[PDB]
Amino acid sequence: ELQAMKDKIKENSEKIKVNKTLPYLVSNVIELLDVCAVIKTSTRQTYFLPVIEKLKPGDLVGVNKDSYLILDKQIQELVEAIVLPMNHKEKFENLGIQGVLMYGPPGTGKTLLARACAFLKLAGAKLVRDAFALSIIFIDEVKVIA
Amino acid sequence: CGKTMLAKAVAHHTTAAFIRVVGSEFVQKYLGEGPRMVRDVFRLAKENAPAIIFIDEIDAIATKRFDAQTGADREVQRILLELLNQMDGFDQNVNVKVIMATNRADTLDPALLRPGRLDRKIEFPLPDRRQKRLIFSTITSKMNLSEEVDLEDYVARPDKISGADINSICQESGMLAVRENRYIVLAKDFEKAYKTVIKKDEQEHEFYK
Amino acid sequence: CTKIINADSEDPKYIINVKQFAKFVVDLSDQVAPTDIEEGMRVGVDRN
Amino acid sequence: SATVDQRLPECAKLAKEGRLQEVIETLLSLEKQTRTASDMVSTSRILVAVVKMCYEAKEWDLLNENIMLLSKRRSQLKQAVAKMVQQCCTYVEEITDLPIKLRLIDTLRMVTEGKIYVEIERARLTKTLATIKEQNGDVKEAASILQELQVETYGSMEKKERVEFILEQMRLCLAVKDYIRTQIISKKINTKFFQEENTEKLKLKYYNLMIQLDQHEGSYLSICKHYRAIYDTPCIQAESEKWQQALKSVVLYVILAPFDNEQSDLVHRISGDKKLEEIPKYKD
Amino acid sequence: HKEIDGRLKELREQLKELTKQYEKSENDLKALQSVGQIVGEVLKQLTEEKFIVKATNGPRYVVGCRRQLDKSKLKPGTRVALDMTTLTIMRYLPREVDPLVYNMSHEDPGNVSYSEIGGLSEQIRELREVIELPLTNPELFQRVGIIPPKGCLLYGPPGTGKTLLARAVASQLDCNFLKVVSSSIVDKYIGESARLIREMFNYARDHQPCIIFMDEIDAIGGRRFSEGTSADREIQRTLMELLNQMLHRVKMIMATNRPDTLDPALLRPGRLDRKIHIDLPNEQARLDILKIHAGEIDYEAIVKLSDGFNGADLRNVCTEAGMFVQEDFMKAVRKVADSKK
Ligand SMILES: Nc1ncnc2c1ncn2[C@@H]1O[C@H](COP(=O)(O)OP(=O)(O)OP(=O)(O)O)[C@@H](O)[C@H]1O
């Protein structure tokens, strides 16, 4: 029967080839439900799909055009608080314990030190959340530094 | 003082159509959407049938029309003017009776207080002694009650208790009894509820007196 | 064109942003080299 | 300290030959010094030692006074108080002459007139007092006394001690025939937790009280469901009589229940259970 | 023979891989013979078979409903999946979810037992009562004769513990929790805030039971004064919308550091039934706060001179002590009190 199953592999492959006529469309994957998807085509329409599978609610996905299917002390302290937790995470947690704003007059070198440590260098809660979503993070106005 | 409840009454005793809207619903971010919504509401009510538009909370839009020296307040003023014009304008309405409720009738525009648009101006004062007695009877109904209770004392004791807080008195007396493992509330239970609802503020810096 | 999706070595699968109309994906073909065709500049998509 | 616990035995001996107030006074002074030094271990040991000395003595009208005073003294340490009350109750539970032991139980209650760190011991002492009172030919007031503990706020160690407290509240309420209170407490209880490993005597008892309450009220379908849960409990399924009695009660209460959709459904389920013993009586 | 048995093993493994591929093939079959529908929203229940449905970002049609559907379920505002060709209502779809409400509700990690709220046993009694008891076992209220309560204020100094106190009840009920930082409701538009509040309460009225916890009601909760600025009047309008919208199995918890600004109407017992006054821990409660945050001699010694404040100061005590025994805890509380002042 394995030969017949190989022939069915062949029919699956030709099915993929015919249904994958490359000139697709691109659409947002806005919304995501199940009893599926609710795509938003680039041409300002929104279309439900029962059958397309862990696509992000907001990912940009291809779709079928027709069926529509898818300071020595300061540097030492910063080096401590940044690097050492990252390496010896378990060491910090040994006892059962668990934002770091940086100050300095204009041009003191906070950005320079952050770059030297570098990772994300983002320059309000929306920006906060997105930056910590996308790992060292420096937030001028996972490892949090602000 | 039980005006939204009286509106809920109509809607369970009116044969006509009912359209309840919130005074803050008419406001919109886009220019002209508020006036468009007011026109849509009034036209729909006029066309459907004898209708009652309950614009609760009218003070969200109708306030005195001052110069307003800005954009958003002018849009609010346009909402108010559209409401005035639809209630009594060139194209007179028929069988579009309107009810609106507000907690502060002084701030409302003097044009939307004109016999012909608002010809009743009903007041809903805080319950008197007699209304307190009636409210207490109506609430303590459908409720097991102890024989030793004297609602007369609570009714007579002069306070500013409104209908909502009378309901709260009865409700929290009920919950106190439930926690006390008893379905028949005693006078101690009420006395507790009455104190906890009166909530007499104190510590008033005494030199004022 | 907006991206070449890395060209996936073979099968470049370019992305196009037909203005005021839509964005699509394309193989193009008929040109000399998938890379020297284009990276991020105007191009003429066939109709159908 | 070593000095403390080598000088305590001599005081114990002297009290044994008889020291009405000298031993008490010297121990009081030592306790004062230790408490000022903030010696909680010394405080606990001295308190337990003195209460034990009294208990070994006659202590009638003396141990209660000693404990009451020691508790009412300066701001004793809460841990020391907890240890003192624990040892006091452990000694109390093994005592006779109930009319006189009532004095010591009342003394424990008064010293625990209410304190966030004597809650569970107060609850146990109240339960013991209620049991003694109901045994003493009067439960009309023991039921009320037990009907004061806020065990849910107390939060005993496990879902055993306070659940037993509530079950005994139910027992006293039904003994005095206080069905509204019993039913409210039943609503307070959540039956799901009875699905555990050792929740067998607890569950049988709880369901028995619920069944008796519903028997008084007059319903029959709820009583059917209660016997159904009882029978499903494995332990009552461990003896011929032990389980056939439960099944017979289930069937008879099904029958007593008035005809209805639920009545018919329960009749069908009990008929299809197939374990009806084919007794020539109940099956037919 | 063992060789033939191994041949059988490899044959079975190959057939299992091909079974996985059969799953792939049925997936492909479904894809090929499936086509996407059109998302729209009903606008009017016309004659039993005719429904006026507006295709979002498009025109509005009159369409028919297929056999297997609940016309009663289909109501104005309900989402619908029309067919592409025949434009027939293939099946309904649940109401839209606002991005703000989605981030607000669907992402809410709450897991804290009542044991983790050391003090405030009484305030636990009142809260738990008002929120839970009407939800679970409402027959008590029915038998008594009182209507079930809706919401409570739960006001207190800055950190005596309100978010935790609401999180505990939310976790115990395991119902739909919806937490707001009310200071974020404010918007630079002229009513989008009222729209957001209305959408929040619609979310609640949809999936019920549901607990709506709004923090810092001080904002969006001020007394209405006659002639404020345009922003002030917008804030008053947002309050007013919340007040009116604020019906079934949607309990409510507020959290604030001030009851002075609160509108008398917003404080009305019909809107906020019980006004809880959780307060800075007293030594009695503070001791057990430290005990629970112990993640007794030392605890009593610390409570002796502890600077009880903000609630979180005791978690700070514990965490700093770990960051560094009786003396270590004592110096930790010394340091935290010195820093706080
Ligand atoms: N006259 C009354 N009789 C009985 N119950 C009343 C009365 N007035 C108020 N109540 C109780 O108070 C609750 C709230 O009343 P209602 O919402 O009608 O008051 P309101 O004055 O319109 O309030 P708001 O200004 O907050 O909109 C009612 O549901 C009822 O529980």
Ligand SMILES: Nc1ncnc2c1ncn2[C@@H]1O[C@H](COP(=O)(O)OP(=O)(O)O)[C@@H](O)[C@H]1O
């Ligand atoms: N009774 C308490 N038991 C345990 N922790 C508490 C208590 N009161 C306050 N806390 C701590 O204080 C912090 C308060 O945080 P949160 O509740 O978000 O703000 P607020 O205290 O203003 O409600 C919590 O992280 C909590 O751990």
